[PDB]
Structure 1
Amino acid sequence: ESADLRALAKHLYDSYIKSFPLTKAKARAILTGKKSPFVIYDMNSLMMGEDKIKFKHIKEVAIRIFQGCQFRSVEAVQEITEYAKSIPGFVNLDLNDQVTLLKYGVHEIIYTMLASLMNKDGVLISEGQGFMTREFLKSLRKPFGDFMEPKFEFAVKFNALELDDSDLAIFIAVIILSGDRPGLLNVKPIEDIQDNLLQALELQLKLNHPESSQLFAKLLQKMTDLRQIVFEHVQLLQVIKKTETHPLLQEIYK
């Protein structure tokens, strides 16, 4: 059984590597020092990064940034979908259930992985070629300035766990196979798979972090912070439905 647990952990790791270009190890290497990324700390550096970078979706700053985040989210959704398909048992599930699990899981996964790109002072952007400051994002006009902040608070807590990519792969898989998403038709094989994934995660944390007491529990506890962050994000998405500022574009985004 342990054999299958480690084989699973490895499979998931390889698949995570193939699906997500910018890994946590890479991101960390960039954030600490190892070809320094362009830094966006204010208006002028933003404009410079627009001209010198590849972020023009051919007019107010906060709205442009928000839309960028949108575009990148749609890409992430495709990457996560591809990863989900590699989870043993996943494609064998009822197709409606696959859709439901992805639809409810992508936000939680996006914030999880976003933590890998973040420190307390900012977030790697543009494939890791840039770094936008926390203070700059906070300085954005309301309510756009309040979007990223809760996520920095989450990431600071989450990053304290010092998980690596091989831990994260399994964790993300556990997140996808959540039996309590609304509207599931057949919960049983979902919870069966998830229980296998949770055993794999347990073994992984125990081997990879022998000195981290109850890391498994703390990680599981982080799911509360994730769901909360997702709820809050939704809550201020509703507020943006004020702000009177591409119908095909309006179609591409959920």
Structure 2
Amino acid sequence: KLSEEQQHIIAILLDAHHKTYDPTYADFRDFRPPVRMSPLSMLPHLADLVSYSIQKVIGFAKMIPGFRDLTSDDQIVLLKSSAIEVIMLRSNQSFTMDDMSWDCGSQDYKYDVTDVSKAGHTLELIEPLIKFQVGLKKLNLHEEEHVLLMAICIVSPDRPGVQDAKLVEAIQDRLSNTLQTYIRCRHPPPGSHQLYAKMIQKLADLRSLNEEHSKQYRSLSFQPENSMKLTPLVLEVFGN
């Protein structure tokens, strides 16, 4: 029941993802080094990770069918509000339930609860984030479903400041109808049972995680000593 327009969308989002997410993590060496000892010892490294990942999210987003047809202003608001969410989503790819960590190929670039808690953010964020990663992993999404969810999350009609919501909604619905049809045609049961409803629920989980991150960013940002450890892009995207 997948239309050729729908199959074209899947094709585009898979390539867009493949072009902006390097599964070998080679670029992690360009980051300020990780420090495992020290309350902000991991901040430099993870700030660089986040900042790098913001760029990659933008690159993926520009390739979303219809995104280009949005105003510059609407592209800005959507990316500013979705960045940390898509970072959490795309991170599920390296997250492993084996030891509850983000395993990016090597021990230097393998981040657990202890590491992630040495960057100025509290368990109020980290605990439900890890829970989120586990709950997302268990959905065992097809990569097709994975890239559709990231794109749907980015093109959300209800983000603060969106001007032409209806168009944003038109774009998202096409992605949504692609996701729902894909699940019907390509995802065998029981893995498919209620899967769309479950993925859309992860988008609600992400709002909650976004809100809490926003709170904790404001806190830490209020100490220039901490803001100094970030990057210009991170400062511009999460608030300046």
Which TM class, normalised by the smaller chain length?
0.7 to 0.9
Match of 2:62, as an amino acid? Answer: K
Q: What runs of 5+ residues in structure 2 fail to find an aligned partner? A: 236-240
* TM-score for the superposition, normalised by structure 1: 0.76
CA contact (8 A) 1:115 1:158 kept: yes
2:158 corresponds in structure 1 to 180
1:21 corresponds in structure 2 to 22
Q: Are 1:92 and 2:69 counterparts? A: yes
1:2 corresponds in structure 2 to 3
Match of 1:207, as an amino acid? Answer: C
C-alpha displacement of 1:202: 0.9
Mapped to 2, the partners of 1:250 and 1:88 lie a distance apart of 30
Give CA deviations for 1:44-69 in whole Å, capped at 9, x if unaligned. Answer: xxxxxxxxx76546998331312211
Mapped to 2, the partners of 1:183 and 1:141 lie a distance apart of 30
Mapped to 2, the partners of 1:82 and 1:72 lie a distance apart of 15
**Alpha carbons of structure 1 residues 199 and 148: separation in structure 2 relative to 1, 3 Å:** same
2:12 corresponds in structure 1 to 11
Mapped to 2, the partners of 1:155 and 1:2 lie a distance apart of 32
C-alpha displacement of 1:6: 1.4
Q: Are 1:83 and 2:64 counterparts? A: no
3-state SS of the aligned residue for 1:8?
helix
Mapped to 2, the partners of 1:17 and 1:64 lie a distance apart of 31
Q: Which moved more, 1:99-108 or 1:207-216?
A: 207-216
> After superposition, where does 1:49-60 map in structure 2 within 5 Å?
56=32
Match of 1:253, as an amino acid? Answer: V
Q: Are 1:64 and 2:64 counterparts? A: no
Q: Paired residues, what number?
A: 225
Give CA deviations for 1:189-234 in whole Å, capped at 9, x if unaligned. Answer: 2111111000111122223322021101111111111111111222
Q: Which moved more, 1:64-73 or 1:54-63?
A: 54-63
**Alpha carbons of structure 1 residues 116 and 246: separation in structure 2 relative to 1, 3 Å:** closer
Mapped to 2, the partners of 1:9 and 1:88 lie a distance apart of 10
3-state SS of the aligned residue for 1:5?
helix
Mapped to 2, the partners of 1:134 and 1:230 lie a distance apart of 20
Runs of 4+ residues deviating >4 angstroms:
57-60, 138-147, 241-250
3-state SS of the aligned residue for 2:206?
helix
C-alpha displacement of 1:94: 0.9
Mapped to 1, the partners of 2:126 and 2:89 lie a distance apart of 13
3-state SS of the aligned residue for 1:225?
helix
Mapped to 2, the partners of 1:139 and 1:180 lie a distance apart of 31
* TM-score for the superposition, normalised by structure 2: 0.80
2:138 corresponds in structure 1 to 160
- Find 2:84's aligned residue among 107, 118, 136: 107
Q: Are 1:219 and 2:199 counterparts? A: yes
C-alpha displacement of 1:246: 8.4
- Find 1:230's aligned residue among 207, 210, 222: 210
C-alpha displacement of 1:122: 3.4
3-state SS of the aligned residue for 2:102?
strand
Mapped to 2, the partners of 1:83 and 1:5 lie a distance apart of 18
Q: What runs of 5+ residues in structure 1 fail to find an aligned partner? A: 28-52
Taking only aligned residues, the RMSD between alpha carbons, in angstroms, comes to 3.0
Mapped to 1, the partners of 2:22 and 2:129 lie a distance apart of 21
CA contact (8 A) 1:19 1:79 kept: yes
C-alpha displacement of 1:140: 5.0
The percent of aligned pairs where both chains have the same amino acid is 26
2:126 corresponds in structure 1 to 148
CA contact (8 A) 2:74 2:162 kept: yes
Give CA deviations for 1:8-64 in whole Å, capped at 9, x if unaligned. Answer: 111211121112112xxx79xxxxxxxxxxxxxxxxxxxxxxxxx765469983313
**Alpha carbons of structure 1 residues 190 and 106: separation in structure 2 relative to 1, 3 Å:** same
